[PDB]
A paper describes a structure:
[name] is a potential pharmacological target, as abnormal levels of SAH can lead to pathological conditions, such as cardiovascular diseases. As reported by Manszewski et al. (2017), [name] can adopt three different conformations, closed, open, and semi-open, which are defined by the relative orientation of the two major domains, the substrate-binding domain (where the Ado1 site is located) and the cofactor-binding domain (in the present structure marked by Ado2). Apart from the relative positions of the substrate- and cofactor-binding domains (here referred to as conformation), [name] has another structural determinant, a molecular gate that controls access to a channel leading to the active site.
[name] crystallized only when 10 and Ado were present simultaneously, whereas the protein incubated with 10 only did not form any crystals. The crystal belongs to the monoclinic space group P21, which is at variance with the orthorhombic system and P21212 space group that are characteristic of all previously determined [name] structures. The present structure reveals a tetrameric assembly, which can be considered as a dimer of intimate dimers (AB and CD), even though the enzyme was deprived of NAD+ (because of the prior cofactor removal procedure). Indeed, the fact that no residual amounts of NAD+ were found in the electron density map confirmed the efficiency of the cofactor removal procedure with ammonium sulfate treatment. Although the molar excess over apo-enzyme was the same (12-fold) for both compounds (10 and Ado), only Ado molecules were found in the electron density maps. One is located in the typical Ado binding site in the substrate-binding domain (hereafter referred to as Ado1), forming the same hydrogen bonding network as in the previously reported structures. The other site (hereafter referred to as Ado2) coincides with the position that was previously shown to be occupied by the adenosine moiety of the NAD+ cofactor in the holo-enzyme (Manszewski et al., 2015, 2017). Otherwise, Ado2 is coordinated by Lys467 of the neighboring subunit (which uses its Nζ atom to form hydrogen bonds with O2′ and O3′ of the ribose moiety, with average bond lengths of 2.99 and 2.73 Å, respectively) in the same way as seen for the equivalent moiety of NAD+. The side chains of His342, however, adopt an orientation of the O state that has not been observed before.
Numbering used by the authors:
A (entry chain D), C (entry chain A), D (entry chain C): 6 to 473
B (entry chain B): 4 to 473
The structure:
Amino acid sequence: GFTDYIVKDIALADFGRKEISLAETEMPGLMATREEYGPKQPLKGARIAGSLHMTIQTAVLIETLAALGADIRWVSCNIYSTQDHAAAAIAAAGIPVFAVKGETLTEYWDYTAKLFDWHGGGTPNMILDDGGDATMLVHAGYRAEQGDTAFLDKPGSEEEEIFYALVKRLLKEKPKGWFAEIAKNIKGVSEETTTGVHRLYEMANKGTLLFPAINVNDSVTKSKFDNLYGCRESLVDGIRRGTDVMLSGKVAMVAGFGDVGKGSAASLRQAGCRVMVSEVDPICALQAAMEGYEVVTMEDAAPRADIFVTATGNKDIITIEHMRAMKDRAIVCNIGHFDNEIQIASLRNLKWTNIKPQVDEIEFPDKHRIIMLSEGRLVNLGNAMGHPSFVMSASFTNQTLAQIELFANNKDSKYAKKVYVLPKTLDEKVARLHLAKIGVKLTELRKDQADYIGVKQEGPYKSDHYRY
Amino acid sequence: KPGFTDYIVKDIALADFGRKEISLAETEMPGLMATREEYGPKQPLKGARIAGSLHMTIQTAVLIETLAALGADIRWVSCNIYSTQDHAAAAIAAAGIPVFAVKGETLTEYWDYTAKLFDWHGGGTPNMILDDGGDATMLVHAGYRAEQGDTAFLDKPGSEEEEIFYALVKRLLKEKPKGWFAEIAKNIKGVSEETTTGVHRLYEMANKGTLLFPAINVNDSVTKSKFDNLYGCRESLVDGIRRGTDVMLSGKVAMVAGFGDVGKGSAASLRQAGCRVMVSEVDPICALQAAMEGYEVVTMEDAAPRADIFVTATGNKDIITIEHMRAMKDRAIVCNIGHFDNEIQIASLRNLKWTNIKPQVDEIEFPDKHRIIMLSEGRLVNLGNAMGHPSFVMSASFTNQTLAQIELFANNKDSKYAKKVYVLPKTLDEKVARLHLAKIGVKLTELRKDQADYIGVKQEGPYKSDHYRY
Amino acid sequence: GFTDYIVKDIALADFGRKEISLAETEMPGLMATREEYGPKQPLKGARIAGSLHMTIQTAVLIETLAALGADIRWVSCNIYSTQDHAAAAIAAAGIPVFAVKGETLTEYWDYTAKLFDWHGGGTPNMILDDGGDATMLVHAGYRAEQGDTAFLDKPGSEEEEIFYALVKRLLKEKPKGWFAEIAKNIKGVSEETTTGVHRLYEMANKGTLLFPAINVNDSVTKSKFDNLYGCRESLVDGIRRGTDVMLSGKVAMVAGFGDVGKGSAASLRQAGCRVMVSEVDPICALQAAMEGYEVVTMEDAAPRADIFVTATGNKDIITIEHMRAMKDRAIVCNIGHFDNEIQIASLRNLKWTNIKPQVDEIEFPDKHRIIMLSEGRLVNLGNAMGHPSFVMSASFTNQTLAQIELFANNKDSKYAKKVYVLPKTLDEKVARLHLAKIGVKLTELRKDQADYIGVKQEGPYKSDHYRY
Amino acid sequence: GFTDYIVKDIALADFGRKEISLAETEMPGLMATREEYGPKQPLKGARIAGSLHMTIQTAVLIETLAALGADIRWVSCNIYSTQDHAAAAIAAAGIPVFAVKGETLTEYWDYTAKLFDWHGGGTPNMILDDGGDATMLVHAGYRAEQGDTAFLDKPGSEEEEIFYALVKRLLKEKPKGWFAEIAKNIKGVSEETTTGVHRLYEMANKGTLLFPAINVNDSVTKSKFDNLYGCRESLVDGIRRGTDVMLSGKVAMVAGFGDVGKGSAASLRQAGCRVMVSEVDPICALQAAMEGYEVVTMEDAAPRADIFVTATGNKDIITIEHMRAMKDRAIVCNIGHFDNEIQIASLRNLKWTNIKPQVDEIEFPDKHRIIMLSEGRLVNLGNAMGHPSFVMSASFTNQTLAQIELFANNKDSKYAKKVYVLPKTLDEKVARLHLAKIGVKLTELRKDQADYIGVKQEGPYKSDHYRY
Ligand SMILES: Nc1ncnc2c1ncn2[C@@H]1O[C@H](CO)[C@@H](O)[C@H]1O
Ligand SMILES: Nc1ncnc2c1ncn2[C@@H]1O[C@H](CO)[C@@H](O)[C@H]1O
Ligand SMILES: Nc1ncnc2c1ncn2[C@@H]1O[C@H](CO)[C@@H](O)[C@H]1O
Ligand SMILES: Nc1ncnc2c1ncn2[C@@H]1O[C@H](CO)[C@@H](O)[C@H]1O
Ligand SMILES: Nc1ncnc2c1ncn2[C@@H]1O[C@H](CO)[C@@H](O)[C@H]1O
Ligand SMILES: Nc1ncnc2c1ncn2[C@@H]1O[C@H](CO)[C@@H](O)[C@H]1O
Ligand SMILES: Nc1ncnc2c1ncn2[C@@H]1O[C@H](CO)[C@@H](O)[C@H]1O
Ligand SMILES: Nc1ncnc2c1ncn2[C@@H]1O[C@H](CO)[C@@H](O)[C@H]1O
Ligand code: NA
Ligand code: NA
Ligand code: NA
Ligand code: NA
């Protein structure tokens, strides 16, 4: 039978299956992908270790991969983002998953290592990564197993301390050569997110990347949809569920005006806030001003905004000094990927009063307070349900095609140990698969029209440098 | 000291959580908190015995505790079977105030609880009613009518709810002392009422001469049309739909039936969240407004096969029928933000297969296997699937309610309020708005005396004629 | 040989006729009114003196009145609002009109007086007024003729001085008792505008109103459409034609948040400005705040807005002190109806440099400059073309119906010397006449549904105090 | 004094100078570029032949180039886009310019040729091009001079035959080797638009590009600003001036959802239209749908839109059949670069009635009509004033830096006979120069923060593939 999982509560599986089924209707790209490739079973023989937010949307991805023949083990890539009913449904479907909403950082890393303990013996031969954590376990352990262990002795953060301790433990406990075995078996890794892509390009440029990688983040139908439209929908959802505050009449500050900040500022303005923005990039700042946002510094915003959202991917955006200047019961949250955008650690010796899960009131010596959401981690996934299914279908269709590329379309070793992106025609295919469900009717070029603009009728329609 | 038992809530252990969100809400309701400060010293509701029937939310908890802070004795129920927020109800019970309200109580339970308002703790009856939808008011008048001998109507129910209500009146007539409804009627000093249907029926009883006590219509305050209905629904309609379904709104088509103030706010809610919004209307002025706001104005027959989301906002009946729902696309979402559960023909769906997804979310399957997603069984979706309107906008409505309670209870020594329906003056509308400006950082300009004279108003207001529409 | 007119240049008549024809297609309420009432000729025998912005839209109103049997003389109610080609077309059709874009204030009032010199002898018997200027001429003259002359020597502005000069001249030049003769013959006035309606109530309150009046301003289908949607379209139109400035990136200040201020703030926001608002009314200030506008004082706004729009109906809103504090080349304009919202008179000792018609640059002693549009008068009509035809059709269908009421439907004296409003049944009918052109499909109440909400199937649908 | 120009009326110079002065305040990037490079005179010795819309904004660019030392001759790149007062001011400043609003196609091309007859003898040594017309004349003439003349006899449109007639006339009239002489002396071309850049890459890929090229279109601070925000402001402006129609209540159709179509659809939605879009590219279609636009075919839109806007860069988008099915008095216009998106030529057999400059009513035999703007040419520039100055300052600051690059910074032959874009640091500087004018306050990265995200504090802040 099947017992190989760790979830909050398996009795949530029925509720998970109901919402998965509903999500399927909202994820036409993944469902069409099942129909197209189901008969050819291109992932038969794949052993996919997946590390990505264990949500309802990711469940539809998991089952798509399975529908295509893949064998799978899964973990979440964040401690708070798991939806426990999604995890229980996957476990009940007989797929190993180690994901609990609110697991500790120590648990998180121990679960990541369970990805590589393949059921029935052996290791994975594919990785599907969001943030590069599974990829980093392999590379760090390989590095150390070869004899370069110095870096493990000097961790740079609390989380890095736990991660390095994991690598040491695995080196002690596993058979000699375990990391080299893993690295040689991985046929490829498709990476979802800017932080992991950064790690890939760094490894690729030092010659230490161990297997081919596909950068799904820079697919057009990911990077121009996922956070732009996803954050537009899910950022205010998080804030409403956390606080139930009236947004009309409030002033909000968004730090950063990349894809995440863009979608986040739109979410708050559409909901009725008067939105201010900070930026270090003069082009991004100009975009913000042209969209009608006042562009200011955090020192300017600190005493006056009602709501603060960090969206920079940098560190020390909202400091202790900012939060001391904040008005009483100002709301503070983060939708960047790490919890160091806000100086959370500097608040830990203040009085915290829990309101409900992922909502805390923090009181300062002068007795003014702030409302912190999700302890300064991803507010959309921590306080609500993350991005809705339809946009995640686009990202996850890219992931599915990327797995097929690496696992089934590398007979000629067109993918070496470097970072690739999907070709534009597959990118366009992802979009195509999502048009019928929302009633889009695409115009077909006549031959004379296609020649007139220098494209084939069937695409690709734009050069590879086109920015959309 | 002694153990308090005079309540019915889901779980008393939610009281600490309720108290926490009540405290947060106080900061967001400056109108109520200022009213506490102003009238606290004079205790204008000392001696008031207020029976309240209003959605037992966090926001209503602040209203309740405002009434109490002004001296009132209180018993409370919700006015909708799904609108209660169980932590708010628990906090009120823990404060020793009788409350009978559970999210997801049945209709039969609902009406039993309404009756409990009138059994005053320690003896006697209420002497004030704070009503939302007229249910407490109707119980008194229907019982009085039957107690006086006119009983035929009790055997003529037009809905399941009327069946249950008429059964309740019959039971109360059998169980309570003779003359009970007359006694209640004699002791009620006034009612304040917030809703369009509640107000409609007050005016109708007034014209018929059957209204039993003075009434104040707070529904025609500028607050209800221009703030509560408009901005509340703009904020809370999509909230309800998101929590119920987690669907992506960008890319979807939505249909809103009605374009009065609730449909205005509802359509705005959906458009701001990224839907393409269509609207239906029977009023050509309201329809022309919708068109001018950029909404396509179509019939429900037109909308039925093509919208992804349907929202009823008409206050009328039989808006979305069994025929319309048969024609909808698979897994269209249907919900109601008008006040009664008959805008959608929910009763005609009960012979079909219902699969419950989670509280207030059900998937309904037709014989051709096509499905719809029904929110809150056709009842107020913002309150059923989410947390209703946010605290800041309820502050103004609830300040109006408090002011109306003061007027009827404390300011009727001269009988300025007969057995008729009255409205608060514009000076109160301006004062209530003014109480909210500082919280959201509004800097009001002060007219100089010459500018005041030039436009023909006093520097302190009122600034508009009484027929001004804002 | 028709000579009884004054226009800038009669050669523009052909161009005027073409745009009048286009506007008819855009004004279905007026054209439906011609079809319904043409056979009966209810305005046969009416002698309408009209004082209302001589635009293409007003030309369609004029010709609607004429199609119903009216004899007409016409003037503009503002010195910059005339569209010279519309005026030419009216004159070319044999209708006396005295309206030149850019006429002087003295000419303006001379022209108002010509309304009452009926061609072929006599006086008018109806007034259609916008702003109350023609009504005021009759009442001030009557007042003085009856012996109460002192006010004629107490002017408080240049315009009052000119108006009182006109009254003195007419009393010297016309037959004794002329004003009483006019007053006796005017069957009614219909008044369009808040300023004129306030003049009407003053006089009705005092018992000095000389004839019945219908307040068209407070039709729903005027005051919930005319200013709200008209200014939303025409305010930025005026600013763009006058200055061609980029509105995205700029900050705008709107004084006033009545229906003109509501429409004006909307126009600017939709055009990409960040909009701020001043108000004295806490209900309107709270509306503005709930719509996401920052509500501030003009002292706060003066050094930081790029664009200033007064919309108050009050005086001394933007002062010389405000304008000295403004940034170099800030834009200032007015869409309230006088020209004392901004302190224009106080600017007349400064160096003015004309850029083009209705656009001037005013230089202060410190060399900073402001850009003044239409000399502080109505900016949508002065720098552009006013509200677009469609929304004016609703207002002007109201006017036509009000003229019919007073002229043809007062045989029983239901309208005494007081101010009346059109009934809601007519208001709903005005709305109905515009629905098909924009493709609205109205739902029809079934009888049980009409009974359920307490209305007749055919309306009216709302109580008389409903605010929409 | 100075005689070498062709403009509509030199008396318009004073008016031109006033609006240029006003634009200078609105174009800080250009004025700051004058401040920075003026003392260096980087364009001393430059002989720039410019082909670009002779607007007020282009005047500031021309005078900027002159201020940096350039000798200049100029023409418009469209027969309707000239602003006559701008042209007159330029002429009056002593700069040869040949640009009249409403010039004929034959005049247009004859003027283009006048660019290359340099005043005082010789040829230009730089080209500043918008749409590649000046570039094409040089390369077409070279190709024929080299002996490949067959193409000049196979024309396909009216403008094509005029262009080939021009080339033949110049070959016949000028000395032998004239185009080779021009090509030898052209140091570089900077090109502003998609159409022109497309021609450039094609020539560069065939080895036939005759001189270095900089593609200014794909600067981020051009492509993500110019038509995104420019069309958002200027498309409805053109429609309003041309027709004065109420946009609220109306349905509009935009063909295309590239940057021009994105900005155009926004222009119409913000003005109050319900907006439908067509697309052939499924990614762009998905973008339109996610922004809430209904995505339809032209066959679907033809009988129900009130307003049609072509923005595809393609041909045969709105056909005679489409137009026969449009409702009476539908508005039709084009904001793509040539007049073949709409089948204007097929309309030349019907009754055209001119309303006013650039506005025509076209009658079909069944008497239904359409309103055509600018005879199907660039509506924002033909019916109004094009993009406002502020956004053009960014475009034109890029142009100035491109001319400096090619003329003054090619001592090491870093620019060969291929197409280049400006470096990201210069792109960032362009945005930087515009921030203060709109009150943007940019955050400065701390050293530790810049390290953390992998950039220098002074930028570049994004990789070269970042899409913004
Ligand atoms: N300290 C910071 N403050 C504001 N924005 C930042 C900061 N660091 C990076 N960003 C911006 O955040 C976006 C996403 O990384 C980028 O556009 C980047 O310029
Ligand atoms: N429902 C979801 N399932 C999986 N990943 C998600 C979901 N919502 C957001 N994300 C991802 O989590 C981060 C926070 O939005 C982004 O990387 C985003 O792509
Ligand atoms: N059957 C109906 N369909 C659509 N709108 C309606 C219907 N009945 C009432 N309304 C509208 O609902 C709004 C709110 O009651 C009013 O503007 C009213 O005209
Ligand atoms: N949070 C809330 N608490 C109490 N009543 C509410 C709340 N939100 C909305 N309502 C009321 O419920 C109805 C639906 O919005 C309206 O009558 C409104 O006033
Ligand atoms: N001095 C003023 N400043 C700002 N708003 C004003 C002033 N006077 C009147 N108003 C407002 O202008 C609007 C239109 O008259 C009204 O809502 C009124 O309150
Ligand atoms: N095109 C127009 N024709 C006639 N009157 C107009 C026009 N545009 C605006 N108005 C009136 O002029 C004032 C300024 O918009 C308002 O009173 C408005 O009703
Ligand atoms: N025939 C066409 N119909 C609709 N859109 C088109 C057509 N041809 C090109 N486009 C789109 O126009 C945009 C601008 O070139 C591109 O996104 C392209 O896909
Ligand atoms: N005011 C202007 N001056 C010069 N070029 C312009 C102007 N406005 C728009 N353009 C250009 O003309 C085309 C149509 O908007 C685009 O290529 C745009 O860059
Ligand atoms: Na979700
Ligand atoms: Na709430
Ligand atoms: Na007009
Ligand atoms: Na311009």
